[PDB]
Amino acid sequence: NYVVENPSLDLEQYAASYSGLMRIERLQFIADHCPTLRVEALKMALSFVQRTFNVDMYEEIHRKLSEATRELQNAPDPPALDTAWVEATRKKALLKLEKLDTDLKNYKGNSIKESIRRGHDDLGDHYLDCGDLSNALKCYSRARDYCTSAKHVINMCLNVIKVSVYLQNWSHVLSYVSKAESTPEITQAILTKLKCAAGLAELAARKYKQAAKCLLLASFDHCDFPELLSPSNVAIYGGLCALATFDRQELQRNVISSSSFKLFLELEPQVRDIIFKFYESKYASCLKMLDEMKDNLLLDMYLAPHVRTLYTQIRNRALIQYFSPYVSADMHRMAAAFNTTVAALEDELTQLILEGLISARVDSHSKILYARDVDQRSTTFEKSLLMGKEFQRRAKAMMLRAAVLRNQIHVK
C-alpha cells in the first residue's frame, strides 16, 4: 500500500505550516509512513503533543517513540515519558475544566442562549485540547441548539466541520458546509473557508471533479487556514484534481478565471509547470515532474490512496490528448514522448483501447498507432440489422408466450 522509503521531506516547514490537532495527526502519519525519518518526526511530534495537555494519544506516541529509540540502539551497534507530567497534566486539566464546567452549569441556571452556546463551544475547545473528540461534539452539539444569529450559525458550522474531520465524519462536514452556504443569502471572506473545507472533505471522500471545482473557487485572501489544510497543499490538491478531471479548455478557463489559483500556482511552481506542460503537449517533462511530485506527496494524509488513482487518471488523460491530433502516430515517437519503453507503452495503449476513449488501432509491425475513424453508416446498418434480428426473436418469444397462455399450458 503506502509506508514507502524516500528521503528529502522538510519536516520543519510541514509541521509549522499546520497547527492544532491537525498538525498532531500530520506528524503521526508522517512518522508512521516515512521510515529512516520516523525518529525526528516522532521526537518533534511528542514535543508538541505534550503541549495542550493530551492524554491518550500521548501514550500511543510515547510508546512509538520508545520503540523507535530502542530500534536506534541496535542498528549502529527508549525515552522516559516523565510520568510527573501525568500527575501535573491531570491535576491542572481537571481543575480548570471543573472551574469552567461550574461556570457553564451556573449559566444554565441563568438561561442565556448565547452564553450557553459560547460556553459549550469553550467546553468543546477544551475537550479537543484534552484529546476528547466525542466529548467536544456533545458540547458542540449542545451549542448548535442555542443559536441566535447568522454568525452564531456560521461558527457552529465551522466547529462541527473541524471536529468531523478528525472524527472522519465527512458527511457531517458536507452537511454543515451546505447549511452554512445555502442559508445566508448565497472584506470578511467567510465563504472561502467553507469552500476550502468542502474541497478537502470531498477529496478525502474519493471525489475529484467537484473537489477541484470547490478548490478552484477558494480565494487566496483566506491566507492562514492551518486548522484544516495549508495553502501549499491546497494548491497541490487543486492542481492534481484539475489535471485528472478538467480537460484542456476546462483547465485553461478555470485556472485563469479564478485568479486565485494563479497565486496558488505561484506557491507551487512544480504543479504550475506540470499543468503548463500538459497544455503545451510536453507530457514527457510533465510526467517526470509528476513522479517527483509522487514521492513528496504520497506521505500526505488524505492524498496517499487518492493520489495513486489521481496519477493513474493523469497518465491516461495525457495519453488520450497526445494521440488526439495524430493520424499516423509512430509508437516510437509516442514512446519517446516519455521515459517509458516501447513495450510498456504498447501495453498501456492496448489497455486504453480495451477500456476506450482513445479510439485507435495498434500496428505492431511498424509500431505506429493509427487512429480509428469508422464509417457511421456501416455501423448504423450493422446494429440496425442486429436490432431487427433481436426484434424478430422477441416477437417469436411473445407469440409463443401468447400461444401457451391462450391454451392454458403450465406445470401443475
Binding site: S19, G20, D224, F225, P226
Partner: protein, 557 residues
C-alpha cells in the same frame, strides 16, 4: 482509614445546602444589625474555631436561640456562611480586607489561609502600605514579611503615598531602620521622615525622639535641626539637648541601596556541571567580575528578557520540549523568582517590551493555529492582567522589538511597524534596503541600532528623520562568525561581541562606539580568567543588581 467520597460526600453537601436555602431545621439564628441568618450549629462549628466555643461553653449562650453578634458585616458573614455550606469562596478584589477582618473575629482558619494567599499575591503597586498596616493590625507574619520586603522597595519608589502617613510607630521603626531600603541616595529617606514627622502635632513629636536616630548620622548634622528650629513647640529645652546627642554615636554604616551597580543579565549560558543544560549569569562592567543568577524554573529554557525603567526583570514563555505560558519576576534581594499571572498563549522566545508602565509581548509563536497569525499581547503591571491589543500587520520570525520615545517599534528582516499605544494601531514605517534576520536591535537615545544579521551590518534609524543609513563595519577578525549584542551602557552606546574561528577559542571583548566617529574604540577586553564560554542562544540585557544578594560564580581561570 477508609474515607471514600465517590458520589456520597457531594450528596451530603448538597442535602445540607438544600436545607439551608429552604430554612429547614435551623436551631441557631444570627442577628447582624437586624439581618437574620438562619443557620446551624454544626456547620458553624467546623468552619469557625470561635463558633465551636460559641455553642459549647456552659455559659448562657448555649441555651439561647437568638444570638446578637455585632462588629461583623452582613455580607462578609453571608459569604462565610455560604462558604461553610458550599466551599466556593468566590472572593472579589475589593472586600478582601473586611472578609479577613471577620475571619479574624469568628476564627475561620480555612478562609484565613485563602485570604492570606490572595493578599500575598495581589500586592501590585499601591495597597502595599495599606495592607502592611492591615498586617500590622492583624498578625499575618507571612504576609507581614512579604509586604515588608515589597513595601521596602515600592515605598522608596513612590515615597509620596498618603496611606503611608497613617502608620504605627513600631512599623515605621521597622521599615525605616531596616537595611533593605532600595534608595540610591541617603537624602530621600531623610526628607521622607521629615514630611512624615511634620504631618501632625506633639503626639508625633514623642515618636520623633525615637525615629530620628534610625538613619545615618551624616543626615543628622544637616539642615534637619535648622528646619526643626522653626517647627519646635515653644519653651522646649531638654528636647534640644537630646537632639544634639544624636551626632556621634549609633554606628554610622553604609546602606544597601547604594550598591545599585549597572550590570548585564545573561541567560542560557554554558553550564559547568554536565547535569544542567543552561544557566543564567551576570557581568559587572566596572567591578570586572562575573556573577551568577538562579534559573527561574530551573528546568525550562528559551525565555525572553525585559527591563523596565524601574530596573525590574521579568521572564515569560519558554519551553521545558513543551511550551509553557508561565510568568516570573526576579527578586533584587532574595535572589529568587516569584511567579505572576501566566499568559493566555504559550509563546516560544517572546519579545517583551516595556512602555508607559505596560509590558508588551510581540510575536514569538503564540499558538500558531490562530486565524490571524500576526498577533501580539500586552501585560498590565498595575492591574496584573493581560489585555488583547491590535494584531500585528505582517508575520515575522526571529524578529526584534524595542521602545523609543514612548512608542513601540518592532524590527524584522526588512520591515518595521510602529505601534501607537494611545490609539492601539500599527503604522507602516521605513523599509530596510538589506534583508537580514536572526539579529536584535538596541534603543539608545532617539536612534535604533540594528546590528548583525544573516554579520556586521550597522544600520542606524532615527525616529525624527525616519531613514536608514550605514555608519561603518565593526573591526573583527576574518574567517569568523561574530555574535553581536547591542545595548545601552552608562548612557553610552556600546557593543558586546564574541568571535569564533576554526580550531580557536572564543574571545569576549566590548567596544565603545562614537556617534560622529562611526568607530568602535577598544573600551575593555573581557579576560577569559574570569568569564568562560557562554554559547550561541544566550541573551543580553541591561539592568542594575546587588552584589551582596547575588553570589560570585566559581570557575577556574
Amino acid at each position: 482509614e477508609r474515607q471514600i467520597n465517590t458520589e456520597y460526600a457531594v450528596s451530603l453537601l448538597e442535602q445540607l445546602k438544600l436545607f439551608y436555602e429552604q430554612q429547614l431545621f435551623t436551631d441557631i439564628v444570627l442577628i447582624v444589625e437586624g439581618t437574620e441568618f438562619p443557620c446551624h450549629k454544626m456547620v458553624l462549628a467546623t468552619c469557625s474555631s470561635y463558633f465551636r466555643a460559641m455553642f459549647m461553653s456552659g455559659l448562657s449562650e448555649s441555651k439561647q436561640t437568638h444570638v446578637h453578634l455585632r462588629n461583623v458585616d452582613a455580607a462578609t458573614l453571608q459569604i462565610i456562611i455560604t462558604y461553610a455550606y458550599t466551599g466556593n469562596l468566590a472572593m472579589n478584589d475589593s472586600t478582601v480586607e473586611q472578609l479577613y477582618e471577620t475571619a479574624c473575629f469568628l476564627q475561620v482558619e480555612d478562609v484565613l489561609q485563602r485570604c492570606r494567599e490572595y493578599l500575598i499575591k495581589k500586592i501590585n503597586a499601591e495597597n502595599c502600605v495599606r495592607l502592611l498596616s492591615f498586617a500590622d493590625l492583624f498578625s499575618c507574619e507571612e504576609l507581614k514579611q512579604s509586604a515588608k520586603r515589597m513595601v521596602e522597595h515600592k515605598f522608596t519608589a513612590v515615597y509620596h503615598q498618603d496611606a503611608f502617613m497613617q502608620l504605627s510607630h513600631d512599623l515605621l521603626i521597622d521599615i525605616l531602620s531596616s537595611d533593605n531600603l532600595n534608595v540610591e541616595k541617603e537624602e530621600t529617606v531623610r526628607e521622607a521622615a521629615m514630611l512624615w514627622l511634620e504631618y501632625n502635632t506633639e503626639s508625633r513629636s514623642q515618636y520623633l525622639s525615637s525615629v530620628l536616630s534610625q538613619i545615618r548620622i551624616d543626615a543628622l548634622s544637616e539642615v534637619t535641626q535648622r528646619a526643626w528650629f522653626q517647627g519646635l513647640p515653644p519653651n522646649d529645652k531638654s528636647v534640644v539637648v537630646q537632639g544634639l546627642y544624636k551626632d556621634m554615636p549609633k554606628f554610622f554604616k553604609p546602606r544597601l541601596g547604594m550598591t545599585k551597580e549597572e550590570m548585564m543579565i545573561f541567560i542560557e549560558a554554558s553550564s559547568e556541571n554536565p547535569c544542567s543544560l543552561y544557566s543564567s549569569v551576570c557581568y559587572s562592567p566596572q567591578a570586572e567580575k562575573v556573577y551568577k543568577l538562579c534559573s527561574p524554573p530551573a528546568d525550562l529554557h528559551k525565555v525572553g528578557t525585559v527591563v523596565t525603567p524601574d530596573n525590574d526583570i521579568y521572564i515569560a514563555g519558554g519551553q521545558v520540549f513543551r511550551t509553557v505560558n508561565c510568568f516570573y519576576w526576579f527578586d533584587a534581594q532574595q535572589n529568587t523568582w516569584f511567579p505572576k499571572t501566566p499568559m493566555l498563549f504559550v509563546r516560544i522566545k517572546p519579545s517583551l517590551v516595556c512602555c508607559e508602565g505596560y509590558i508588551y509581548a510581540i510575536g514569538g509563536d503564540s499558538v500558531g493555529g490562530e486565524l490571524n497569525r500576526r498577533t501580539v499581547e500586552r501585560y498590565d503591571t498595575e492591574k496584573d492582567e493581560w489585555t488583547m491589543v491590535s494584531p500585528l500587520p505582517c508575520a515575522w520570525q526571529w524578529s526584534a522589538a524595542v521602545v523609543v520615545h514612548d512608542c513601540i517599534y518592532v524590527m524584522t528582516l526588512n520591515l518595521m511597524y510602529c505601534y501607537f499605544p494611545r490609539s492601539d494601531s500599527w503604522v507602516e514605517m521605513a523599509m530596510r534596503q538589506t534583508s537580514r534576520s536572526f539579529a536584535s536591535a538596541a534603543a539608545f537615545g532617539d536612534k535604533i541600532f540594528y546590528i548583525g544579521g544573516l554579520s556586521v551590518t550597522v544600520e542606524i534609524y532615527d525616529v525624527n528623520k525616519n531613514e536608514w543609513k550605514m555608519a561603518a563595519n565593526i573591526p573583527a577578525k576574518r574567517y569568523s562568525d561574530p555574535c553581536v549584542r547591542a545595548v545601552v551602557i552608562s548612557n553610552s552606546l556600546c557593543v558586546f561581541m564574541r568571535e569564533t574561528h576554526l580550531n580557536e577559542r572564543a574571545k569576549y571583548v566590548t567596544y565603545q562606539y562614537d556617534l560622529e566617529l562611526d568607530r568602535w574604540s577598544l573600551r575593555q577586553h573581557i579576560s577569559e580568567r574570569v568569564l568562560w564560554d557562554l554559547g550561541r542562544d544566550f541573551r543580553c540585557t541591561v539592568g542594575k543588581l546587588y552584589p551582596s544578594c547575588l553570589e560570585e560564580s566559581p570557575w577556574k581561570p
